[PDB]
C-alpha cells in the first residue's frame, strides 16, 4: 500500500489557502465542549481551494464597518498563506489525540461544485447538492479504466485527478476522437484519500493530484527548494 509519507507527497501537489496573520497563525473560532465537558476539537479554521476567494473573505472583513475592538485589531494583519494539502493532512493525523486540536473546514471553488453536479446529471445520477471538494478523472468509458498521461522525458505515466473540471475537459477532448464513449467521472477528495489509504493495488503509485490553473500559476511564482 501507499505509505503515509507517500500519501502526503501526493496531497502536497495541491495548495490550500488559509486566512492567517503575518506569521501564518490561522484565523479560527473556538469549539465548544461536548455536553459533559470533553472536546473533539479546540478551534476551527476555514480553508480555501481558491486564493482569490480567501482574499475576498479578508477584503470583506476589512471593509465591514462598525467592527468590534477584536475584529478591528485582527483585520489589520490578515493575509492569505499557501499550505500544501499534505501538511494539513499530516497535521490532522498527528493531532487526533489533542482535544484542543485545530480542525479545518474546506471551501471548494464554486465553479467546480456547479461543474460536478452537471457531470453527475449526464451519468444518470443528478444530485441536489455536492459535499466535499470535487475531483475529475477522465475515463475511456463509464465502464472502462482511467486514462493515463505521458510525463517527464522517459516513458513514465500518471493518472491525473483534476481539481478543476476545465482541465479534465481538456484531456477528455484529446481522448474522445479515438474513444467516443470517453467521459469525466466525478470524485471527491475524501473518497480518493480513503482509496489511497485502503488499497494495495500498485498502480495507485501513478495517481497524481492536479490543482487548478490558478494554483499552478501561483505556485510557479514561488521560491523552491534545491
Resolution in Å equals: 2.0
Q: How far is CA 174 from the centre of its chain?
A: 25
> Cβ distance 171 to 210 under 8 Å?
no
> Cβ distance 115 to 162 under 8 Å?
no
> Cβ distance 220 to 174 under 8 Å?
no
Which method was it determined by? X-ray
> Cβ distance 49 to 16 under 8 Å?
yes
Each domain of the chain, given as residue ranges in start order, spans 1-226
The β-bridge partners of 106 are: 47
Longest dimension (CA), the chain: 63
Amino acid at each position: 500500500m501507499l505509505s503515509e509519507q507517500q500519501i502526503k507527497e501526493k496531497l502536497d501537489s495541491v495548495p490550500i489557502y488559509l486566512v492567517t496573520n503575518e506569521k501564518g497563525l490561522p484565523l479560527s473560532r473556538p469549539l465548544p465542549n461536548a455536553p459533559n465537558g470533553q472536546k473533539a476539537g479546540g478551534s476551527i479554521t476555514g480553508a480555501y481551494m481558491s486564493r482569490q476567494e480567501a482574499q475576498a473573505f479578508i477584503n470583506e472583513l476589512r471593509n465591514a464597518k462598525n467592527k468590534d475592538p477584536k475584529m478591528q485589531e485582527i483585520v489589520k494583519s490578515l493575509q492569505v498563506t499557501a499550505v500544501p494539502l499534505g501538511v494539513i493532512y499530516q497535521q490532522l493525523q498527528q493531532t487526533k489525540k489533542d482535544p484542543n486540536r485545530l480542525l479545518f473546514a474546506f471551501k471548494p471553488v464554486d465553479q467546480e461544485i456547479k461543474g460536478a453536479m452537471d457531470l453527475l446529471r449526464q451519468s444518470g445520477q443528478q444530485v441536489n447538492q455536492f459535499k466535499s471538494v470535487p475531483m475529475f478523472a477522465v475515463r475511456f468509458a463509464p465502464d472502462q479504466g482511467y486514462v493515463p498521461i505521458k510525463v517527464g522525458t522517459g516513458n513514465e505515466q500518471v493518472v491525473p485527478l483534476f481539481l478543476s473540471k476545465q482541465d479534465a475537459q481538456g484531456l477528455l477532448g484529446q481522448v474522445k476522437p479515438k474513444h467516443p464513449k470517453a467521459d469525466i467521472q466525478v470524485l471527491d477528495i475524501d473518497g480518493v484519500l480513503q482509496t489511497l489509504q485502503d488499497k494495495n493495488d500498485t498502480w495507485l503509485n501513478q495517481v497524481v493530484l492536479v490543482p487548478s490553473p490558478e494554483s499552478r500559476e501561483y505556485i510557479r511564482t514561488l521560491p523552491k527548494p534545491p
